[PDB]
From a paper:
This light-driven energy conversion is facilitated by two multisubunit membrane protein complexes, photosystem I (PSI) and PSII, which orchestrate light absorption, charge separation, and electron-transfer processes. Various light-harvesting antenna subunits bind to the PSI and PSII cores, optimize the capture of solar energy, and facilitate the transfer of excitation energy to the photosystems. LHCs specific to PSI (LHCIs) associate with eukaryotic PSI monomers to form the PSI-LHCI supercomplexes, whose structures have been elucidated in various eukaryotic species through cryo–electron microscopy (cryo-EM).
The structure reveals a monomeric PSI core bound with seven LHCI subunits. The PSI core comprises 13 subunits: PsaA, PsaB, PsaC, PsaD, PsaE, PsaF, PsaI, PsaJ, PsaK, PsaL, PsaM, PsaO, and Psa28. Encoded by the nuclear gene Psa28, the Psa28 subunit features two transmembrane helices that interact with PsaB. The G. sulphuraria LHCI-1 was identified as RedCAP, a protein with unique structural features distinct from the LHC protein family. The characteristic structure of RedCAP is largely defined by a loop region inserted into a cavity formed by PsaB, PsaI, and PsaL at the lumenal side, as seen in the PSI-FCPI structure of the diatom Thalassiosira pseudonana. Most of the electron-transfer chain components of G. sulphuraria are identical to those of C. caldarium; however, the secondary electron acceptors could not be identified as phylloquinones, which are present in PSI of most photosynthetic organisms, including cyanobacteria, algae, and land plants.
Author numbering:
A (entry chain D): 4 to 141
B (entry chain J): 1 to 42
C (entry chain O): 55 to 149
D (entry chain L): 3 to 141
E (entry chain C): 2 to 81
F (entry chain F): 29 to 189
G (entry chain A): 14 to 752
Write the structure that this text describes.
């Protein structure tokens, strides 16, 4: 579960943050644990102060969360971050890391989606799928 | 003559410029001494 | 009065009074240059106000000294007002 | 000090400044017909119409192609009515596409509410233009 | 959504997964290559179509391919 | 044929061009003192102009109704100097440049400095090839018949079709 | 403290034959033609070569000596051409009736036609650099003095080249030396600017003043004493300026009014030469020298006295601006890009100020009635200014990508700017749309009304007037200031504001410039074009590191083509791409400035006066009625004034005809690069490579199409060269014929 009452980094605010679409379509949350108070760069621009302990931020896009995640990992060696999608109705999907392990590391249990049992040069010609719903890359 | 200097004089732009300048000079000098050759005289 | 969201601001009108007196007094020291006559900028401006109000509807012409007096007088007034507000702000621990 | 996160939320895309959150700003905006409390959509539209119709005649009267004729003001008035009709159709089109069965608790953000507002705007605007004509034709 | 496909010339280097800024991709077990893993695209609803994955892929021709398709708010990268 | 043209020595328009050109130069000449550097410069232009017009007059180049030399490039030998002979000269020189350049490229590919010798020329090697260009037509012809000029179509890369 | 490391870098030619030695990426050598372009593009990007700030600083300092050497060679060349290949002396004797020339062409393939009839028995290219007027003001009266200055220039060049070598290879300063910003400022204010100005005052008083006074009285140059005669024989000076009889006693006793004969406050212009009074110029430089020498005692160096720059900055914070200027001192002592950004912005802005000030207050004798020189100098200095301003944007963006850190900028002014970048850019966007509509829109209104036969409905002086009343009022203040708000000044700073028509020969030097509707309109065009150029560059800087579209943009760097076709398409998001676009708008903006200048001066200022006093302007006052429509600019400016350049074949101006066409060609060729993309070109190259492979003549360095970014760079560089050289040729051909 997320925990909506988790505290946030210290930040004076900006105009780069989320707009109406975050309220009535979807927004994203990233949480992490830091050992110490530390300044980091907001993906919406500006310096913010990481609390020691738990940290919660909301963003409009998944890419903003992951961008921050990459910064946490690279600059601060924090790899305990979690990303969630938050709907207006209150529902919460956990997104990343999906199964506990980062996607770049092989993990048993995962199943191949969107793989093909051929090389790219063995796709059929467009004319063959003319007047049917198939694609050449299906 | 110093081998490193000679290697530098062998680089594409240096040889490029020297060779084009000599070629250009030859054409200039032909036209300075035999001007206005619209055709081969015969 | 709140200058922002939840930020009460003093807005003390003594600043305006002190500023106005602080400028108007020294600006009334007389000068020798032809445009100011033998009076100061304050007097010159006030005289031009009267002379232009004498022609109520007709506004001052371009070439009327009025415009130079008005601008010069206001430049000085606004500088004193500006530093006066900042000074009062320092006293009230705005920083 | 004077600039703060908007609604005490630093991750919302806005800042609280003097221009948007001072007491003067809140006093002005709150009392404008579009925001003011205990107004029907019709009356909101009527007040807005009147204010806009009144000022619309000035440009047409003084700068239009018939400004130097004896009928300058009448041309001014007809131009306003023209402008007002286009704006009303704009309002009709906006309401028609923007609202459906969703009966929101604002009122105005509804099909019926927006139609009352549009009615107001039209009548108010021709009225205000009319009132401006009567002042100018005398004075 | 954009279509992302992984072809059987994949050598399981992981570079596409590392390149992806939207977490569309992941490595799954496989027998087909020495690395004993293949790239997978389980979350193409989050794919923006930036093609950083293809830039990262070392094989010739590519083993990962992005076919740009039906646009959504997600795919267009809108924060409004 | 070429009834619309006339020899430039028979052309009245071509002669008037000389007269008008010189007349302008002599007006320019009158602005300067005899013996001055400026005066001598203008005199050289006058001499050069006269030489040019007289050279064309004595050549048997044809003139249009504009009174300007028009060149015939259909192959007839009475106008060989106007295009055919320049053409042979160009082909001989350009073929040389191409042939010696192709020879150098191939020589360095048979070394460890195949790339280095493209940006830093092996000048002795280059001069050897440049010196050998004078019989490029025969060289190229023999190379063609030996089957050394061209790669086979199956040995050159192509895209899908 | 002087801190140096000795014998750092050996001097040999080893690395000269190792292209791209300076970069890890390039040192491995080419596999592809892309490497050849990368070598050149990365040669002076020193901070990409190494992480060491000390190493970067040393290269820069040494490169600067290299630049100074090049400038001395160029300067030396100008003096030498003056001495050897010019009509300077002839011009000196008769400056009203001789055109300056200091370039002569060799007689090859008929090009000697370019040696124009400039007078003084001389034939050569007419120059527009203003060198002759400069040299006259300096008191140079013969070719020997030019020769010796040329030689001194070659000596200085060699000295700069030695210092560059020495301070890189032999005695390279440590980083701590470069970060002595307080000491640098003290020396550049008091030493470079202060003593420079004092030294020049010395020249002015002892050399320029006497020689020019004798020239202007009508003494023949050859009959004037040499400069040292005035120094050794004080009586020669005292004849011209009697206060020299009193010597230096007035100076030390503060009886400075005694020197009011050679230190003046006249204003206006010398009536003989049409230039500023040299006695005013002398006094200007003395005053400037004093102020600068005082200014250079502000900062603390090796003693207790003076300010810390850091302390000043840290104190300036208020209730609207968080931590204020905290952290800026660290930025400006650790980032060369941050320094370059400021210094380019100011140097560029200054060049533009010089353009305006020099036309209106012509400082040299016989400058004002040398119309080709006036037009050339204004135009040249405007362009230099524009390019520098765009550079400021480039280096501000490079700083944001490479040198900015959040920890250094917590709640300071820089942090707070980027935290409301949407508010800044949205408002600037709006002001640009507003300005565009209410400036250019007025021309379109006018074109439409005039085409429809409704001149009474136009914005014009004789219909709906838009008078620039504020500018008109300022003109009036400046015209009445002498003897009033400036009581001890005798005449206006400039006759452009009002007053007399100054004429030299029968040519107008300077006269009042009336401002009407046409002037109001074109001023708002300038406001518009400058705001848009600012928008593009500011946006580049504020969004260099990230945006809503690309949250990790900084990791992609300053210069990258895009982040792929996704998110709708992301071409040209980088900071570099904002500079690219900003160059076109700077070009657009400055083109209209120089066109405004050219037309306004010809219509309303330049021309002839009769003895009766009847002014005849070059284009006869057509600006007021023609410059208020686009058709008027197309017809009465471009079409009408292009007659000179377009009819130049067969004359000494034929070079300009050729350059005009050539420049149109280069401009059009640029569009091939700007409108296309490399995918097309790389495919075409594949087929061509097939033919080379077939004939066993394919290179081992594989041909590639230019990078996406290089395509853009090549495009804008040809667009600017073609566009600017077209105007150059247009302007020179015209002004040399009629002026
Ligand atoms: C406060 C009420 C007021 C009213 C009713 C007017 C009324 C008028 N003014 Mg205005 N004027 C005013 C204040 C006012 N003025 C102020 C505060 C200034 C700034 C100094 C001016 C400066 C001004 C100028 C420069 C001009 C007018 C002019 C006019 C006339 C058009 C009209 C009678 C115009 C006129 O007709 O006078 C010549 C005109 O040219 N006025
Ligand atoms: C022109 C009018 C003027 C000027 C120059 C000043 C200047 C000053 N006042 Mg202010 N003051 C003024 C009017 C003025 N005052 C008025 C009208 C009031 C009544 C409201 C006050 C009430 C007031 C208070 C309560 C305080 C001050 C203080 C100060 C000092 C520090 C704060 C400051 O404003 O820095 C201004 C900075 C400078 C003058 C130096 C910087 C260089 C200048 C700005 C260059 C500008 C262009 C080149 C400074 C010497 C503070 C202080 O420390 O007392 C000594 C303080 O506590 N003032
Ligand atoms: C160029 C420098 C500059 C400028 C343009 C401003 C401008 C302003 N200052 Mg600031 N201020 C500055 C430097 C500056 N300040 C510095 C260096 C300090 C440190 C002493 C301050 C400390 C300061 C205080 C304490 C206050 C201001 C306030 C203000 C506002 C005064 C309103 C007014 O002008 O009355 C007409 C104005 C927006 C005042 C404010 O809040 O007004 C709303 C206020 O109280 N400033
Ligand atoms: C873009 C600038 C521009 C401007 C300023 C003008 C101005 C004018 N045009 Mg021209 N015109 C233009 C461009 C422009 N035109 C272009 C691009 C074309 C296409 C070729 C034309 C073609 C054209 C024709 C065919 C005609 C005109 C005519 C006119 C005149 C009357 C128009 C009118 O009545 O509008 C009505 C104006 C309004 C309804 C409102 C204007 C905007 C208001 C004032 C903004 C106020 C904002 C406010 C400050 C915000 C404060 C908020 C807060 C304090 C509450 C007027 C002089 C007519 C004429 O007779 O000329 C003499 C005419 O017949 N124009
Ligand atoms: C293509 C057809 C078209 C026609 C027939 C007109 C006709 C006119 N335009 Mg032009 N105009 C057009 C296209 C057209 N416009 C376009 C595309 C542009 C943008 C470039 C303009 C820009 C333009 C400007 C800037 C101006 C005009 C003006 C005029 C009027 C000038 C003659 C006059 O003195 O009347 C004097 C005007 C009147 C007596 C008022 C007539 C108002 C009518 C009765 C209102 C009717 C509205 C309509 C029935 C509403 C329903 C339509 C829709 C919602 C279903 C005339 C009515 C001038 C004008 O006076 O406009 C107000 C004017 O200033 N036009
Ligand atoms: C259109 C193609 C064409 C080509 C490839 C050639 C090629 C040649 N012609 Mg040309 N010729 C041409 C058209 C052409 N001709 C036309 C239309 C005319 C009449 C105007 C001529 C008139 C012409 C003459 C009079 C002569 C040639 C000759 C030649 C040869 C040298 C060369 C084979 C010369 C030759 O000797 O032919 C064997 C020669 O004397 N041609
Ligand atoms: C030895 C060098 C060499 C040789 C034998 C060829 C031969 C050929 N080229 Mg290639 N080409 C070359 C260099 C060479 N090229 C270079 C350097 C470029 C880059 C500009 C090209 C770009 C190029 C294009 C775009 C095209 C060709 C084409 C062709 C073919 C037709 C003729 C032509 O259009 O030339 C035109 C080529 C030029 C005008 C480029 C200038 C050639 C330079 C001057 C030669 C350089 C010589 C080299 C530096 C000598 C060093 C030798 C020394 C060290 C010993 C022919 C197979 C065409 C083709 O494919 O037809 C089927 C074609 O479309 N070439
Ligand atoms: C930026 C600096 C600069 C530039 C653009 C020029 C340009 C020129 N110089 Mg000048 N020159 C310069 C600096 C410069 N010079 C300096 C510093 C000196 C002192 C050494 C000279 C001394 C000089 C002499 C003595 C001559 C020139 C000549 C020329 C012209 C022909 C040069 C040539 O064809 O080379 C040919 C290349 C060779 C390698 C030989 C050309 C207009 C020539 C000229 O004006 O002829 C009338 C000429 O005779 N120059
Ligand atoms: C220049 C005049 C700007 C006056 C702004 C007023 C001004 O100077 O305010 C200055 C004011 C001063 O704040 P502080 O007292 O904290 O400043 C202390 C300093 O030491 C640190 O900056 O700053 C702000 O309020 C933020 C700026 C907002 C800017 C908003 C408007 C921007 C657009 C301006 C459009 C006019 C352009 C006209 C150009 C001719
Ligand atoms: C300048 C200024 C400003 C602003 C202003 C404004 C913006 C104004 C506006 C105003 C307006 C804009 C107004 C209006 C008005 C209107 C009116 C007054 C109306 C009336 C009406 C009537 C009376 C009637 C009506 C009617 C009729 C006729 C009948 C039927 C219908 C009806 C009922 C509707 C400010 C404050 C900022 C500041 C100071 C200065
Ligand atoms: S196109 Fe971009 S977002 Fe989509 S899978 Fe590839 S890297 Fe990820
Ligand atoms: S980058 Fe290419 S080869 Fe490597 S894991 Fe991804 S698809 Fe496979
Ligand atoms: S068109 Fe070119 S610049 Fe634009 S996204 Fe595609 S590759 Fe990048």
């Amino acid at each position: 579960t997320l925990n909506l009452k988790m505290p946030s980094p210290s930040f004076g605010g900006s105009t780069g943050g989320w707009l109406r679409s975050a309220e009535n379509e979807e927004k994203y949350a990233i949480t992490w644990i830091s050992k110490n108070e530390e300044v980091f760069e907001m993906p919406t621009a500006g310096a913010a102060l990481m609390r020691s302990g738990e940290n919660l931020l909301y963003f409009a896009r998944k890419e903003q969360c992951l961008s921050l995640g990459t910064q946490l990992k690279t600059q601060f060696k924090i790899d305990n971050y979690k990303i969630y999608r938050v709907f207006p109705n209150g529902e919460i999907q956990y997104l990343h890391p999906k199964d506990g392990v980062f996607p770049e590391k092989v993990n048993e249990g995962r199943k191949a989606i969107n793989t093909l049992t051929r090389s790219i040069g063995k796709n059929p010609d467009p004319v063959v799928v003319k007047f049917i719903n198939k694609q050449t890359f299906e | 003559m110093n081998k490193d200097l000679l290697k530098y004089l062998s680089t594409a732009p240096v040889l490029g410029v020297i060779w084009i300048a000599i070629t250009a000079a030859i054409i200039v000098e032909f036209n300075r001494l035999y001007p206005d050759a619209l055709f081969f005289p015969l | 009065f709140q200058i922002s969201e939840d930020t009460p601001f003093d807005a003390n009108p003594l600043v305006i009074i002190v500023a106005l007196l602080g400028w108007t007094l020294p600006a009334s020291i007389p000068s020798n240059i032809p445009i100011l006559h033998g009076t100061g900028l304050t007097q010159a401006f006030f005289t031009s106000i009267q002379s232009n109000l004498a022609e109520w509807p007709k506004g001052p012409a371009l070439d009327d000294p009025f415009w130079l007096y008005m601008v010069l007088w206001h430049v000085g007034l606004f500088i004193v007002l500006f530093f006066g507000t900042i000074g009062y702000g320092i006293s009230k621990n705005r920083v | 000090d004077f600039i703060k996160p908007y609604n005490d939320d630093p991750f919302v895309g806005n800042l609280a400044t003097p221009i948007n959150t001072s007491s003067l700003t809140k006093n002005l905006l709150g009392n404008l017909p579009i925001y003011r409390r205990r107004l029907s959509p019709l009356l909101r539209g009527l007040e807005i119409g009147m204010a806009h119709g009144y000022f619309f005649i000035g440009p047409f009267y003084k700068l239009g192609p018939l400004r130097n004729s004896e009928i300058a003001l009448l041309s001014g008035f007809l131009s306003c009515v023209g402008l007002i009709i286009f704006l009303t159709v704009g309002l009709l089109l906006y309401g028609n596409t923007s609202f459906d069965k969703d009966e929101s608790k604002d009122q105005l953000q509804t099909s019926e509410g927006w139609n009352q507002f549009t009615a107001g705007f039209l009548v108010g605007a021709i009225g205000g233009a009319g009132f401006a004509y009567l002042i100018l034709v005398n004075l | 959504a954009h279509n992302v496909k992984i072809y059987d010339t994949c050598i399981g280097c992981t570079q596409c997964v590392r390149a992806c800024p939207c977490d569309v991709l992941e490595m799954v077990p496989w027998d087909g290559c020495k690395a004993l893993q293949i790239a997978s695209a389980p979350r193409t609803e989050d794919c923006v179509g930036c093609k950083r994955c293809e830039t990262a892929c070392p094989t010739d021709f590519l083993s990962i391919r992005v076919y740009l398709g039906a646009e959504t708010s997600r795919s267009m990268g809108l924060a409004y | 044929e070429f009834n619309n043209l006339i020899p430039c020595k028979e052309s009245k328009i071509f002669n008037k061009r000389l007269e008008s050109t010189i007349k302008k130069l002599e007006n320019k000449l009158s602005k300067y003192e005899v013996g001055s550097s400026s005066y001598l410069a203008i005199k050289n232009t006058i001499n050069k102009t006269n030489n040019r017009f007289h050279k064309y007059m004595e050549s048997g180049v044809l003139c249009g109704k504009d009174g300007l030399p028009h060149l015939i490039a259909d192959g007839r030998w009475s106008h060989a100097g106007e295009f055919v002979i320049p053409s042979l000269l160009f082909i001989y020189i350009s073929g040389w440049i191409g042939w010696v350049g192709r020879g150098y490229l191939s020589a360095i590919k048979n070394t460890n400095k195949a790339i280095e010798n493209e940006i830093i020329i092996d000048v002795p090697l280059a001069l050897k090839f440049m010196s050998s260009g004078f019989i490029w037509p025969l060289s190229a012809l023999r190379e063609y018949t030996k089957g050394d000029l061209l790669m086979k179509d199956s040995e050159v890369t192509i895209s899908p079709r | 403290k002087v801190l140096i490391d000795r014998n750092v870098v050996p001097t040999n030619f080893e690395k000269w034959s190792k292209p791209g030695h300076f970069s890890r990426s390039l040192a491995k050598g080419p596999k592809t033609t892309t490497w050849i372009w990368n070598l050149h593009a990365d040669a002076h990007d020193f901070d990409s070569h190494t992480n060491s700030l000390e190493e970067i600083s040393r290269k820069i300092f040494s490169a600067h000596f290299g630049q100074l050497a090049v400038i001395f060679i160029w300067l030396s060349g100008m003096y030498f051409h003056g001495a050897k290949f010019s009509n300077y002396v002839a011009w000196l004797n008769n400056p009203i009736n001789i055109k300056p020339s200091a370039q002569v062409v060799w007689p090859i393939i008929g090009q000697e036609i370019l040696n124009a009839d400039v007078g003084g028995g001389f034939q050569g290219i007419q120059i527009t650099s203003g060198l002759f007027q400069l040299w006259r003001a300096s008191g140079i009266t013969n070719e020997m003095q030019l020769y010796v200055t040329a030689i001194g220039g070659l000596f200085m060049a060699s000295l700069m080249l030695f210092a560059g070598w020495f301070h890189y290879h032999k005695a390279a300063p440590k980083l701590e030396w470069f970060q002595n910003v307080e000491s640098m400022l003290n020396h550049h204010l008091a030493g470079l600017l202060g003593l420079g100005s004092l030294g020049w005052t010395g020249h002015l008083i002892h050399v320029s003043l006497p020689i020019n006074k004798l020239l202007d009285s009508g003494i023949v140059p050859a009959q004037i004493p040499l400069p040292h005669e005035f120094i050794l024989n004080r009586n020669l000076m005292s004849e011209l300026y009697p206060s020299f009889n009193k010597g230096l006693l007035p100076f030390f006793t503060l009886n400075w009014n005694e020197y009011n004969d050679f230190l003046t406050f006249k204003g206006g212009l010398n009536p003989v030469t049409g230039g500023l009074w040299l006695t005013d110029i002398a006094h200007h430089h003395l005053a400037i020298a004093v102020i600068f020498i005082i200014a250079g005692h502000m900062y603390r160096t090796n003693w207790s006295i003076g300010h810390s720059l850091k302390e000043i900055l840290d104190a300036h914070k208020g209730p609207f601006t968080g931590e204020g200027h905290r952290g800026l001192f660290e930025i400006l002592t650790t980032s060369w890009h941050a320094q370059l950004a400021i210094n380019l912005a100011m140097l560029g802005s200054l060049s533009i100020i010089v353009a305006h000030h020099m036309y209106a207050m012509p400082p040299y004798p016989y400058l004002a009635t040398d119309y080709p020189t006036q037009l050339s100098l204004f135009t040249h200095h405007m362009w230099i200014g524009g390019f520098c301003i765009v550079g400021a944007g480039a280096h501000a963006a490079i700083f944001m990508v490479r040198d900015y850190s959040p920890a250094q900028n917590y709640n300071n002014l820089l942090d707070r700017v980027i935290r409301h970048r949407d508010a800044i850019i949205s408002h600037l966007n709006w002001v640009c749309i507003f300005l565009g509509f209410h400036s250019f829109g007025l021309y379109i209104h006018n074109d439409t009304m005039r085409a429809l036969g409704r001149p009474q409905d136009m914005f014009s002086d004789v219909a709906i007037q838009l008078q620039p009343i504020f500018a008109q009022w300022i003109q009036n203040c400046h015209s009445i200031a002498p003897g009033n708000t400036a009581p001890n000044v005798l005449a206006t700073t400039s006759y452009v504001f009002g007053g007399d028509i100054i004429s030299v020969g029968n040519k107008i030097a300077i006269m009042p410039m009336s401002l009407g509707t046409a002037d109001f309109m074109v001023h708002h065009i300038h406001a518009f074009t400058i705001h848009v150029t600012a928008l593009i560059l500011l946006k580049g800087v504020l969004f260099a590191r990230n945006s809503r579209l690309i949250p990790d943009k900084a990791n992609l760097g300053f210069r990258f083509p895009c982040d792929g076709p996704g998110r709708g398409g992301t071409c040209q998001v980088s900071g570099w791409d904002h500079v690219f676009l900003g160059l076109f708008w700077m070009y657009n903006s400055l083109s209209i400035v120089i066109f405004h200048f050219s037309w306004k001066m010809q219509s309303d200022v330049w021309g002839t006066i009769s003895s009766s006093g009847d002014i005849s302007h070059i284009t006869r006052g057509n600006f007021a009625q023609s410059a208020i429509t686009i058709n008027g600019w197309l017809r009465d400016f471009l079409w009408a004034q292009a007659s000179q350049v377009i009819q130049s074949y067969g004359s000494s101006s034929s070079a300009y005809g050729l350059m005009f066409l050539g420049a149109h060609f280069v401009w059009a060729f640029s569009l091939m690069f700007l409108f296309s993309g490399r995918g097309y070109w790389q495919e075409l190259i594949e087929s061509i490579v097939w033919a080379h492979n077939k004939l066993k003549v394919a290179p081992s360095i594989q041909p590639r199409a230019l990078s996406i970014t290089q395509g853009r760079a090549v495009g804008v560089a040809h667009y600017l060269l073609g566009g600017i050289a077209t105007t150059w040729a247009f302007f020179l051909a015209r002004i040399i014929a009629i002026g």
